Amino acid sequence: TPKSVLPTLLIIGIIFAPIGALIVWGSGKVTTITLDYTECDVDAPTDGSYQAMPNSAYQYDLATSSSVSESSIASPTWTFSNDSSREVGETARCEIEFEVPYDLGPGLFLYYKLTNYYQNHRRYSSSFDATQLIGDSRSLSQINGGNCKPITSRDGKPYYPCGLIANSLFNDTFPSVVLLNPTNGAQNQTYNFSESGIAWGGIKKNYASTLTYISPSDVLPPPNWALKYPNGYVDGFPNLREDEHFQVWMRVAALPTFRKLWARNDGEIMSQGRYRIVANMNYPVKQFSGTKSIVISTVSWIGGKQPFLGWAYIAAAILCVVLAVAGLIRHLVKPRKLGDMSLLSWNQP
């Protein structure tokens, strides 16, 4: 039997090693820039100047082919401005200037990372009404008794969209990413991140553009959407189908530390230089010891930068080779005859 076991271990190792090497190579072909702007409210200058961000507020994950080092890149700088004369959703702005060490090929994606955000909690994970979202006819009793608890209705007017997931929509935007030192002339060049296509095309069908059974004045906006819809849905129902940030948010994340796509670019190259990114800080996460970050990453054949599977394959291959070598040594030392009869119970002293 071990004659059919040792070659199995050798084959497993010899097949696993190339797969792990390929996964590691693909992960190393990816560049990730992380910018933690959670503490920009209090730790950033408010006079218009730029101060270097703390070493724990940013993390560069450079490609294996990069000729520069992590410490060689200049530290990003940030500034804060909280002015009440701007429109709602853009009063507080955090402008972060960061350097891209090398040209990042087409396929640049912009994410926001939330830490200590338990979307997988039982109360939150199921706090939505798919029947109401799809546009079907739901009565007050049905929505009250549905899975949308505890945000179901008030004063006889149901919430649309109801539930904890919709109420906690991430209302922090990153409107502009601008290059500060363009080589091709001009004072600055705006990197055109597009908010279209950030969600798969089938997520739209889960939601309806409008409701044909309740007038907009008979629907209450979610409690945390009050600052966005002060007097309610006075301009028609929100188009939950044509907006993709809502669809991205509604997809429950597996872990408390998760990244959700916010704008993308698929046909431009981020040239080497210094880029300024503006974040409209509107979603507080400091209350529950949470942090919000900005993640800019490319994509390889495996997706993001995660070489864990490749190293697991390599370790498995090494373990299998060691076990096969030990088994071969043991078999050569004391080879045993298969199907003997001297070790039976009756054929022993």
Binding site: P150, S168, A199, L255, T257, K305, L309, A316, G339, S345
Partner: protein, 1088 residues
């Protein structure tokens, strides 16, 4: 008492359930499984609106299905029992109604008048009233212990006067004084009194009723003419039913061992729930102090913490309910039913004799795995190890053996004269009646099988017995029609230690020679001869011949001869007549008379009768003893017959020393203690139990104990402990003359003091009680009322069928059931473990990582067929090897296939594999997109990858755990994962308009992702590598007998199992039956 005038209803009622009360008792016996209580609690909890997941009806549906399936199983079993009982309570018995009308065995209360004719059973206990032969005597048969035809004399004065039906109608002789119904089969009392009968004092005479007058229920098989009687002690007060017992609800040892495993799983689930509740409560209090987005609006009476901690407790019990799956018991029941069907359909345990076929039927559809753990077998002797057929085999005439007589009979040789005398003694010294219904046949109706066989052999090989048409006997020698006068009988009836029987006779010819013909045992007759020198030589030759007869195994009678002179004949006739009326010590007087007449005899030869056992019994017993099963004999027959059968069945080998314990002189406990001290004194472990003749050659010890000694042992406790020690320290124990209750007591003694599994096999009411008292009861179908068959769990027709049944079916069933249960627990632990390992990362909120469809169909679709295939078709070794090598039964008998250690190994394997799956795939999916399209990683991508990996791992683990392999194994193992893959492919394209489905687009997020395609195979390989290595190294380093034999058969098919130096070449008297007084005594009065 009764005092019936011309009580207990009727019917055997062997049905466990009743139409009125079936649901309650069935539900109780189903809820004796603990897991059913847990399922009911979970369903009741889910009835509440807060904990509802799908619907109350669909939640209750699995439990209702389990209950309905088990109820239908039990109902089919009890319907078979009802049919078997109705075959008994709808026979034909003629009861008076001025004619004898047919009845149905039910319209028969105490009283009545029953005519039973010949060769049919009794409806209840009756009191003899009249019979057609003489003195109103009748005859009985076996099935109530013993193996000879008994006799019942008369009722005394009520005898006669009732020949026709009109006398029965016109007479109201009743008001019997019947005592209380007792289980003992040796005591009855009463008095007919009669309504119209007066003595000299104008009082109604008392007519005692004893056992010699009554005849019990279920055992007559009457061998005489019609008999009329009065039904008394009818119904459940009969001896047979009272000695029987209520039908038990037997359960396999595997279920009794499964209960602690279910309790352990429930404790683990409770610990998980407690940890989840505590951590969730602390986290929710913290997240409510600082208003998190997932804890908003937590101020109501049902959504605040504390209440949320209790809700998390309940949701933890609901989420991990598969740690004790409900599909486990349905699968177990179906597999056990199909195993019973396999037992039924086996053609090697199917009997076909005289045009009727008797398959082996499993009365209890469970207990199949119980057959594989048998350590003690308690077997009846008569009808189970014997065919109840006596065949004459060899005869010794002086010096010459026979196995030629016509050539020998030269009418001039002295050997011819001795042969003539021998056959005359054989054919004339007999209390046998000859019937002239058909000329030439000369039907012989004998009271003993030995006498019938001897007379038939004498007729077939010469001297034919004509009959007793008058007081003068006749004989048919093959020369002419001779006849000789019949003098006074001198039958000792094999009683009062008189192992002999003599018949004084006379010759009708002018010679008028008085000759005494005597037959008896070896020692008595040999010591009872006149040996000067020539009879000494004849005696030594006959002793050598009889030793030869006993060596092969035969029952031997020594014939004798004597010529009485007329003077001594008349003197002894006068002495016998005087001693006939002696009042005090009449037995002593007749013993002295017998000694006086038997003063000198001339030897004629000896016989040799074989008690034919069932075919294959010695080989079956040898194979069972090789397998390690200790076989005992519990029989109601006498000690001599039991020990002879034990010698002939290889139960008692020639190298065993017999410890015979019987009541007499020394006390039973003292006898056991002395036997232990004198035969097992050099035992270290004996002293732990000590804290309070005859034999052949050293090399082993066997115990023979009678019923009275067993009663004295069971009365107290010290004697019971001594008996247990001696019986466990002996090879085999033969229990002779035991009541049904004593058989049950022996079985209970072993099963309770030792705790070992027991099997009981027999074909009678005593066997009925013994069968009900054991773990597995086996009945033998022999057209003997079918009572043992009706009360058993398995019905076989031969002992060798028991041998195969155990060795192959029990071993296979135990192996399959153990593997199936362990794999079921393993796969459910895999699913629950993936859920739990996610619960580590979710804040312990009891949330399903998987989409609920993947957990809902975990046992219905993903993992069902590998478990069913293991439970039905898995074979550890082929049946030829198991039949050829009974020593392979050790693993099944010692319980090395099912236990807590194997359960723990499978549980921890599942825990480790689930940890590998979840953790590796989680750290794989800790990324931004997992594909080149940039779309985020949401929970259900990782969940579906983990679910597919878990299904693959579970199915391939079950596949690795199968010794046999064919196409069907591949079909099952890849039918599970095929179903999950196709379901993931199709379910993820259902548009949201048709159904929400929760996982729309996973066919794009998984089948186009490197994470999925490189995570599920890596997870599978890493999870299954330890099992593969462990199995290989266990089979190649620490191998069992079964594994080694499987390798030998696979690689060396040319090895002959039966005759191989290391495999097969190592292989690893007197008897006579008599009625013991009665009609023979009444024969003396008639011939006086």
């Amino acid at each position: 008492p009764r005092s019936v005038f011309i009580f207990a209803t009727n019917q055997n009622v062997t049905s466990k359930y009743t139409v009125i009360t079936f649901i309650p008792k069935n539900l109780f016996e189903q809820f004796r499984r603990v897991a059913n209580c847990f399922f009911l609690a979970i369903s009741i909890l889910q009835f509440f609106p807060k904990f509802s997941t799908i619907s109350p009806g669909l939640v209750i549906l699995p439990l209702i299905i389990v209950l309905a399936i088990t109820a239908l199983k039990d109902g089919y079993e009890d319907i078979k029992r009802h049919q078997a009982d109705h075959r008994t309570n709808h026979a034909i018995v003629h009861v008076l109604g001025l004619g004898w009308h047919r009845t149905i065995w039910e319209d028969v209360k105490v009283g009545d008048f029953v005519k039973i004719y010949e060769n049919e059973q009794f409806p209840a206990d009756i009191v003899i009233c009249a019979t057609s032969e003489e003195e109103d005597v009748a005859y009985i048969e076996t099935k109530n212990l013993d193996g000879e035809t008994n006799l019942k004399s008369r009722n005394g004065v009520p005898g006669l006067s009732h020949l026709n039906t009109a006398e029965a109608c016109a007479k109201a002789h009743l008001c019997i004084d019947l005592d209380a119904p007792e289980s003992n089969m040796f005591r009855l009392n009463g008095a007919v009194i009669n309504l119209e009968e007066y003595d000299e004092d104008e009082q109604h005479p008392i007519h005692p009723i004893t056992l010699e007058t009554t005849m019990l229920r279920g055992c007559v098989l009457k061998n005489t003419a019609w008999v009329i009687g009065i039904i008394v002690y009818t119904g459940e007060d009969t001896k047979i039913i009272r000695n029987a017992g209520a039908t038990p609800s037997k359960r396999s040892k595997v279920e009794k061992q499964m209960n602690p495993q279910v309790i352990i799983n429930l404790v683990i689930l409770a610990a998980i729930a407690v940890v989840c509740a505590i951590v969730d409560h602390v986290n929710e209090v913290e997240w409510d102090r600082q208003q998190a987005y997932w804890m908003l609006f937590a101020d109501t009476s049902g959504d605040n913490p504390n209440i949320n901690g209790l809700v998390t407790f309940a949701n933890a019990f609901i989420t991990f309910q598969n740690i004790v799956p409900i599909s486990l018991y349905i699968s177990i029941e179906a597999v056990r039913t199909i195993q019973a069907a396999f037992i039924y359909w086996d053609r090697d345990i199917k009997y076909k004799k005289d045009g009727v076929t008797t398959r082996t039927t499993a009365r209890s559809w469970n207990l199949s795995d119980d057959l594989g753990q048998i350590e003690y077998i308690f077997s009846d002797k008569t009808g189970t190890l014997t065919q109840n057929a006596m065949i004459f085999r060899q005869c010794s005439v002086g010096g010459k053996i026979y196995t030629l007589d016509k050539d020998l009979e030269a009418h001039d040789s002295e050997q011819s004269r001795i042969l003539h005398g021998f056959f005359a003694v054989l054919g004339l010294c007999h209390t046998v009646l000859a019937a002239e219904t058909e000329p030439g046949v000369i039907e012989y109706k004998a009271q003993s099988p030995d006498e019938a066989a001897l007379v038939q052999s004498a007729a077939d090989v010469g001297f034919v017995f004509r009959g007793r048409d008058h007081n003068i006997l006749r004989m048919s020698t093959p020369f002419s029609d001779v006849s000789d006068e019949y003098e006074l009988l001198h039958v000792l009836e094999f009683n009062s230690a008189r192992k002999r029987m003599s018949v004084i006779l006379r010759k009708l010819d002018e010679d008028g020679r008085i000759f005494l013909l005597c037959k008896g045992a070896d020692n008595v007759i040999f010591e009872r001869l006149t040996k000067d020198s020539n009879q000494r030589e004849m005696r030594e030759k006959t002793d050598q011949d009889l030793q030869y007869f006993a060596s092969e195994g035969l029952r031997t009678l020594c014939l004798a001869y004597r010529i009485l002179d007329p003077q001594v004949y008349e003197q002894w006739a006068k002495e016998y007549h005087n001693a006939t009326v002696a009042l005090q010590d009449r037995e002593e007087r007749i013993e002295s008379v017998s000694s006086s007449i038997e003063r000198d005899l001339i030897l004629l030869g000896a016989t040799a009768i074989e008690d034919k056992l069932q075919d294959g019994v010695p080989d079956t017993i040898s194979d069972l003893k090789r397998a390690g099963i200790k076989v005992w004999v519990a029989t109601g027959d006498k000690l001599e017959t039991a020990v002879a059968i034990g010698y002939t069945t290889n139960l008692l080998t020639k190298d065993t020393n017999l410890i015979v314990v019987r009541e007499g002189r020394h006390s039973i406990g003292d006898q056991l203690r002395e036997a232990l001290e004198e035969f097992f004194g050099e035992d270290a472990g004996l002293r732990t139990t000590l804290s309070r003749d005859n034999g052949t050659r050293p090399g082993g010890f066997s115990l023979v104990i009678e019923g009275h000694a067993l009663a004295h042992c069971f009365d107290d406790e010290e004697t019971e402990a001594l008996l247990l020690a001696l019986s466990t320290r002996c090879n085999t124990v033969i229990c002779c003359r035991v009541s049904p209750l004593q058989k049950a007591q022996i079985v209970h003694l072993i099963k309770d003091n030792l705790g070992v599994m027991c099997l009981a096999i027999g074909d009678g009411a005593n066997d009925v009680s013994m069968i009900q008292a054991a773990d597995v009861g086996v009945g033998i179908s022999g057209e003997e009322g079918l009572q043992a068959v009706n009360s058993s769990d398995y019905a076989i027709a031969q002992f060798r069928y028991l041998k195969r049944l155990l060795l192959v079916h029990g071993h296979w069933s135990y192996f399959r059931n153990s593997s199936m249960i362990l794999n079921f627990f393993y796969k459910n632990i895999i699913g629950i473990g993936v859920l739990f390992w996610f619960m580590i990362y979710c804040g312990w909120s009891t949330t399903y990582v998987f989409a609920y469809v993947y957990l809902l169909f975990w046992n219905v679709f993903w993992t069902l067929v590998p478990v069913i295939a293991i439970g039905l078709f898995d074979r550890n070794i082929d049946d030829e090897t198991l039949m050829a090598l009974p020593e392979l039964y050790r693993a099944s008998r010692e319980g090395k296939y099912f236990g807590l250690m194997r359960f723990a190994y499978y549980i921890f394997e599942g825990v480790y594999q689930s940890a590998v799956i979840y953790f590796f795939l989680n750290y794989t999916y800790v990324t931004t997109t997992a594909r080149g399209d940039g779309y985020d990683v949401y929970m259900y991508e990782m969940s579906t990858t983990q679910a597919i990996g878990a299904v693959m791992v579970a199915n391939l683990f079950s596949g690795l755990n199968i010794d046999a392999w064919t196409g069907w194994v591949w079909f099952a193992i890849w039918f599970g994962p095929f179903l999950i893959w196709v379901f993931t492919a199709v379910y993820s394209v259902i548009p949201p308009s048709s159904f929400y489905t929760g996982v729309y687009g996973n066919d794009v997020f998984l089948f186009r992702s490197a994470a999925y395609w490189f995570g599920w195979p890596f997870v599978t390989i890493i999870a299954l590598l330890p099992r593969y290595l462990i199995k290989t190294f266990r089979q190649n380093i620490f191998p069992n007998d079964v594994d080694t034999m499987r390798l030998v058969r696979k690689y060396h098919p040319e090895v002959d199992l039966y005759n191989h130096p290391m495999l097969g070449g190592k292989l690893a008297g007197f008897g006579f039956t008599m009625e013991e007084g009665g009609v023979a005594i009444q024969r003396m009065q008639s011939r006086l």
